[PDB]
Design a protein around this motif. Structure first.
Motif, PDB file in Angstrom:
ATOM      1  N   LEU A   1       7.000  31.416  30.017  1.00  0.00           N
ATOM      2  CA  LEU A   1       5.740  30.950  29.450  1.00  0.00           C
ATOM      3  C   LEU A   1       5.041  32.172  28.864  1.00  0.00           C
ATOM      4  O   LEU A   1       4.650  33.087  29.610  1.00  0.00           O
ATOM      5  CB  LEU A   1       4.871  30.300  30.529  1.00  0.00           C
ATOM      6  N   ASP A   2       4.914  32.232  27.539  1.00  0.00           N
ATOM      7  CA  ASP A   2       4.586  33.491  26.862  1.00  0.00           C
ATOM      8  C   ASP A   2       3.352  33.366  25.971  1.00  0.00           C
ATOM      9  O   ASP A   2       3.458  32.955  24.807  1.00  0.00           O
ATOM     10  CB  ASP A   2       5.769  33.939  26.037  1.00  0.00           C
ATOM     11  N   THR A   3       2.179  33.782  26.494  1.00  0.00           N
ATOM     12  CA  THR A   3       0.941  33.728  25.717  1.00  0.00           C
ATOM     13  C   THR A   3       0.958  34.708  24.548  1.00  0.00           C
ATOM     14  O   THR A   3       0.160  34.565  23.620  1.00  0.00           O
ATOM     15  CB  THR A   3      -0.292  33.994  26.605  1.00  0.00           C
TER      16      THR A   3
ATOM     17  N   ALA B   1       3.432  35.049  22.391  1.00  0.00           N
ATOM     18  CA  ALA B   1       4.323  34.552  21.344  1.00  0.00           C
ATOM     19  C   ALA B   1       3.645  33.407  20.602  1.00  0.00           C
ATOM     20  O   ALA B   1       3.231  32.432  21.228  1.00  0.00           O
ATOM     21  CB  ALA B   1       5.609  34.020  21.981  1.00  0.00           C
ATOM     22  N   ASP B   2       3.538  33.500  19.265  1.00  0.00           N
ATOM     23  CA  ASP B   2       2.968  32.379  18.511  1.00  0.00           C
ATOM     24  C   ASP B   2       3.877  31.157  18.580  1.00  0.00           C
ATOM     25  O   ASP B   2       3.394  30.014  18.573  1.00  0.00           O
ATOM     26  CB  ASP B   2       2.823  32.714  17.016  1.00  0.00           C
ATOM     27  N   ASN B   3       5.184  31.391  18.622  1.00  0.00           N
ATOM     28  CA  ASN B   3       6.184  30.338  18.501  1.00  0.00           C
ATOM     29  C   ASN B   3       7.160  30.375  19.666  1.00  0.00           C
ATOM     30  O   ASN B   3       7.253  31.346  20.418  1.00  0.00           O
ATOM     31  CB  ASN B   3       6.978  30.425  17.186  1.00  0.00           C
ATOM     32  N   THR B   4       7.915  29.288  19.770  1.00  0.00           N
ATOM     33  CA  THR B   4       8.918  29.069  20.797  1.00  0.00           C
ATOM     34  C   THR B   4      10.291  29.451  20.246  1.00  0.00           C
ATOM     35  O   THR B   4      10.665  29.026  19.146  1.00  0.00           O
ATOM     36  CB  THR B   4       8.845  27.592  21.176  1.00  0.00           C
TER      37      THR B   4
ATOM     38  N   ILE C   1      11.935  36.794  12.525  1.00  0.00           N
ATOM     39  CA  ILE C   1      10.843  37.071  13.462  1.00  0.00           C
ATOM     40  C   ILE C   1      11.041  38.444  14.089  1.00  0.00           C
ATOM     41  O   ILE C   1      12.167  38.897  14.291  1.00  0.00           O
ATOM     42  CB  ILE C   1      10.692  35.988  14.552  1.00  0.00           C
ATOM     43  N   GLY C   2       9.945  39.129  14.394  1.00  0.00           N
ATOM     44  CA  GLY C   2      10.051  40.536  14.743  1.00  0.00           C
ATOM     45  C   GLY C   2       9.097  40.970  15.832  1.00  0.00           C
ATOM     46  O   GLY C   2       7.995  40.440  15.977  1.00  0.00           O
ATOM     47  N   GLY C   3       9.505  42.014  16.544  1.00  0.00           N
ATOM     48  CA  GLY C   3       8.649  42.637  17.542  1.00  0.00           C
ATOM     49  C   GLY C   3       9.171  43.959  18.043  1.00  0.00           C
ATOM     50  O   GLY C   3       9.653  44.785  17.266  1.00  0.00           O
TER      51      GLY C   3
ATOM     52  N   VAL D   1      10.739  24.583  16.976  1.00  0.00           N
ATOM     53  CA  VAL D   1      11.531  25.443  17.851  1.00  0.00           C
ATOM     54  C   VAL D   1      12.410  26.339  16.990  1.00  0.00           C
ATOM     55  O   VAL D   1      13.075  25.857  16.064  1.00  0.00           O
ATOM     56  CB  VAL D   1      12.384  24.625  18.842  1.00  0.00           C
ATOM     57  N   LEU D   2      12.391  27.642  17.268  1.00  0.00           N
ATOM     58  CA  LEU D   2      13.239  28.610  16.576  1.00  0.00           C
ATOM     59  C   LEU D   2      14.449  28.909  17.455  1.00  0.00           C
ATOM     60  O   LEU D   2      14.302  29.119  18.663  1.00  0.00           O
ATOM     61  CB  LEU D   2      12.469  29.904  16.324  1.00  0.00           C
ATOM     62  N   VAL D   3      15.645  28.924  16.861  1.00  0.00           N
ATOM     63  CA  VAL D   3      16.892  29.121  17.597  1.00  0.00           C
ATOM     64  C   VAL D   3      17.602  30.350  17.048  1.00  0.00           C
ATOM     65  O   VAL D   3      17.810  30.465  15.831  1.00  0.00           O
ATOM     66  CB  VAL D   3      17.810  27.893  17.490  1.00  0.00           C
TER      67      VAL D   3
ATOM     68  N   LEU E   1      -3.374  39.503  25.194  1.00  0.00           N
ATOM     69  CA  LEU E   1      -3.012  39.171  26.570  1.00  0.00           C
ATOM     70  C   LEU E   1      -1.665  38.467  26.547  1.00  0.00           C
ATOM     71  O   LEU E   1      -1.560  37.362  26.009  1.00  0.00           O
ATOM     72  CB  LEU E   1      -4.065  38.254  27.197  1.00  0.00           C
ATOM     73  N   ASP E   2      -0.641  39.078  27.150  1.00  0.00           N
ATOM     74  CA  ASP E   2       0.763  38.697  26.931  1.00  0.00           C
ATOM     75  C   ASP E   2       1.491  38.439  28.249  1.00  0.00           C
ATOM     76  O   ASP E   2       2.062  39.374  28.830  1.00  0.00           O
ATOM     77  CB  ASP E   2       1.425  39.817  26.129  1.00  0.00           C
ATOM     78  N   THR E   3       1.540  37.174  28.686  1.00  0.00           N
ATOM     79  CA  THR E   3       2.221  36.833  29.930  1.00  0.00           C
ATOM     80  C   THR E   3       3.725  37.023  29.830  1.00  0.00           C
ATOM     81  O   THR E   3       4.390  37.062  30.868  1.00  0.00           O
ATOM     82  CB  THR E   3       1.903  35.397  30.375  1.00  0.00           C
ATOM     83  N   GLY E   4       4.269  37.111  28.619  1.00  0.00           N
ATOM     84  CA  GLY E   4       5.679  37.379  28.388  1.00  0.00           C
ATOM     85  C   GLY E   4       6.054  38.854  28.394  1.00  0.00           C
ATOM     86  O   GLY E   4       7.222  39.196  28.143  1.00  0.00           O
ATOM     87  N   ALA E   5       5.101  39.753  28.644  1.00  0.00           N
ATOM     88  CA  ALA E   5       5.361  41.185  28.709  1.00  0.00           C
ATOM     89  C   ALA E   5       5.277  41.630  30.153  1.00  0.00           C
ATOM     90  O   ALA E   5       4.260  41.416  30.821  1.00  0.00           O
ATOM     91  CB  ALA E   5       4.352  41.977  27.869  1.00  0.00           C
ATOM     92  N   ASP E   6       6.338  42.297  30.632  1.00  0.00           N
ATOM     93  CA  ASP E   6       6.240  42.888  31.959  1.00  0.00           C
ATOM     94  C   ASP E   6       5.248  44.044  31.969  1.00  0.00           C
ATOM     95  O   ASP E   6       4.551  44.237  32.965  1.00  0.00           O
ATOM     96  CB  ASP E   6       7.588  43.472  32.411  1.00  0.00           C
ATOM     97  N   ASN E   7       5.158  44.769  30.851  1.00  0.00           N
ATOM     98  CA  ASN E   7       4.496  46.062  30.765  1.00  0.00           C
ATOM     99  C   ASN E   7       3.430  46.033  29.684  1.00  0.00           C
ATOM    100  O   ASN E   7       3.488  45.242  28.736  1.00  0.00           O
ATOM    101  CB  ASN E   7       5.511  47.163  30.398  1.00  0.00           C
TER     102      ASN E   7
ATOM    103  N   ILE F   1      12.437  49.857  27.089  1.00  0.00           N
ATOM    104  CA  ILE F   1      12.048  48.457  27.192  1.00  0.00           C
ATOM    105  C   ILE F   1      12.825  47.659  26.155  1.00  0.00           C
ATOM    106  O   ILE F   1      13.157  48.160  25.077  1.00  0.00           O
ATOM    107  CB  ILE F   1      10.520  48.240  27.061  1.00  0.00           C
ATOM    108  N   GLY F   2      13.112  46.408  26.497  1.00  0.00           N
ATOM    109  CA  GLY F   2      13.902  45.547  25.641  1.00  0.00           C
ATOM    110  C   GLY F   2      13.115  44.367  25.124  1.00  0.00           C
ATOM    111  O   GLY F   2      12.771  43.468  25.890  1.00  0.00           O
ATOM    112  N   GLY F   3      12.848  44.370  23.818  1.00  0.00           N
ATOM    113  CA  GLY F   3      12.073  43.337  23.169  1.00  0.00           C
ATOM    114  C   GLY F   3      12.937  42.378  22.371  1.00  0.00           C
ATOM    115  O   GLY F   3      14.165  42.336  22.485  1.00  0.00           O
ATOM    116  N   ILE F   4      12.263  41.594  21.527  1.00  0.00           N
ATOM    117  CA  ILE F   4      12.958  40.550  20.787  1.00  0.00           C
ATOM    118  C   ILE F   4      14.103  41.120  19.973  1.00  0.00           C
ATOM    119  O   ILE F   4      15.160  40.486  19.850  1.00  0.00           O
ATOM    120  CB  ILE F   4      11.970  39.736  19.927  1.00  0.00           C
ATOM    121  N   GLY F   5      13.922  42.315  19.411  1.00  0.00           N
ATOM    122  CA  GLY F   5      14.863  42.892  18.468  1.00  0.00           C
ATOM    123  C   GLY F   5      15.791  43.924  19.055  1.00  0.00           C
ATOM    124  O   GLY F   5      16.757  44.324  18.392  1.00  0.00           O
TER     125      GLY F   5
END
Ligand SMILES: CC(C)CN(C[C@@H](O)[C@H](Cc1ccccc1)NC(=O)O[C@H]1CO[C@H]2OCC[C@H]21)S(=O)(=O)c1ccc2c(c1)C(=O)O[B-]2(O)O
Ligand SMILES: [Cl-]
Ligand SMILES: [Cl-]
Ligand SMILES: [Cl-]
Lengths: 98, 99
Positions: free
Chosen positions: A23-25, A27-30, A46-48, A74-76, B24-30, B47-51
């Motif tokens: 559950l990720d506040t 992230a804009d998207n799933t 999508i990037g981060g 939903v993004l896959v 505020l990011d509940t999906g971030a450990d750090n 740290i390991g992110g989306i990319g």
């Protein structure tokens, strides 16, 4: 429920007929790991942290999130973790409280 | 407060006497903040992110105010796209997810 943040807020979801997702506040998207979904899709980037990945965008997908049904985009693609973003968190009425 | 999620949950933070915007990011450990000067010694962290995985600088016991709530804890500095307040500090301020 009320979920504390000592550990990752992981829940079971049902999508496309079961997965664990965060559950990720932040992230804009799933974003869900590779799977098949029905219907049309279009590509998206999508990037981060660590850069960008290519995903497939499916619209109007139903997901059961910890027992609550929601519908949305939903993004896959090759995400390292399944993420439930704000687009679906709003639909289950999730809030951050402090 | 009770923060809904129709918009990004952005708050003002204060760190090193300066105000910054953070998510505020509940999906971030750090907690990860863009390049800035912090006092003391630092240690390496991956740290390991989306990319993929990246290297950041870990500073411990840093004074930081989050939406007016005082916290003291670990702050990672590196190439993040936005400042993120992760679970290490969200727990300090008493944040929970509710539905
Ligand atoms: C960075 C942030 C502003 C945005 N992201 C969410 C963030 O919560 C990630 C979620 C995540 C969690 C685990 C692994 C990968 C990703 N957490 C994260 O990077 O946390 C780091 C800090 O602590 C560490 O612990 C966890 C990893 C480390 S995102 O995933 O990059 C992301 C999600 C959705 C979208 C986009 C980008 C985009 O561009 O469009 B989009 O479709 O809206
Ligand atoms: Cl949506
Ligand atoms: Cl609402
Ligand atoms: Cl900490």
């Amino acid at each position: 429920p009320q979920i504390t943040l000592w550990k990752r807020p992981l829940v079971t979801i049902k999508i496309g007929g079961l997965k664990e997702a965060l559950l990720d506040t932040g992230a804009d998207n799933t974003v869900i790991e590779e799977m098949s979904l029905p219907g049309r899709w279009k590509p998206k980037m999508i990037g981060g942290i660590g850069g960008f990945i290519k995903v497939r965008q499916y619209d109007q997908i139903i997901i059961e999130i910890a027992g609550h049904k929601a519908i949305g985009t939903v993004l896959v693609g090759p995400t390292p973790v399944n993420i439930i973003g704000r687009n679906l968190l709003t639909q289950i009425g999730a809030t951050l409280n402090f």
